Design a protein around this ligand. Structure first.
Ligand SMILES: *[C@@H]1O[C@H](CO)[C@@H](O)[C@H](O)[C@H]1NC(C)=O
Lengths: 48, 48
């Protein structure tokens, strides 16, 4: 989320997230969210 | 699944917002009840 050169849509960067503990509060406070349309899961209960 | 996102109620209750969860819940109910009705009808015929 703190990158500087997010690649263009024609060649979208892909990263793998594994072997860690996820707390999306950093994801919340590191962006003035404009659209958070989650489909397969409710954003509220995301930490369990 | 009968056309829902998943066949486990505990899974589909913690992966969707309550206002939308009812849509996926109200498919398992109907599938299960049609299965039950089919069972009871064949049982009545066998009993006869
Ligand atoms: C990391 O985030 C901080 C806080 O927004 C920002 O000041 C800093 O420039 C960021 N670093 C990079 C390399 O983007």
């Amino acid at each position: 989320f703190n990158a500087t050169r997010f690649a263009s849509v024609y060649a979208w960067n892909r990263t793998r997230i594994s072997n860690c503990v996820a707390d999306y509060s950093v994801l919340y406070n590191f962006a003035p969210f404009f659209a958070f349309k989650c489909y397969g899961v409710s954003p509220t209960k995301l930490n369990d | 699944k009968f056309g829902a996102i998943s066949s486990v109620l505990n899974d589909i209750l913690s992966r969707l917002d309550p206002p939308e969860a009812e849509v996926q819940i109200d498919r398992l109910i109907t599938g299960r009840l049609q299965s039950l009705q089919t069972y009871v009808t064949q049982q009545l015929i066998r009993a006869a």
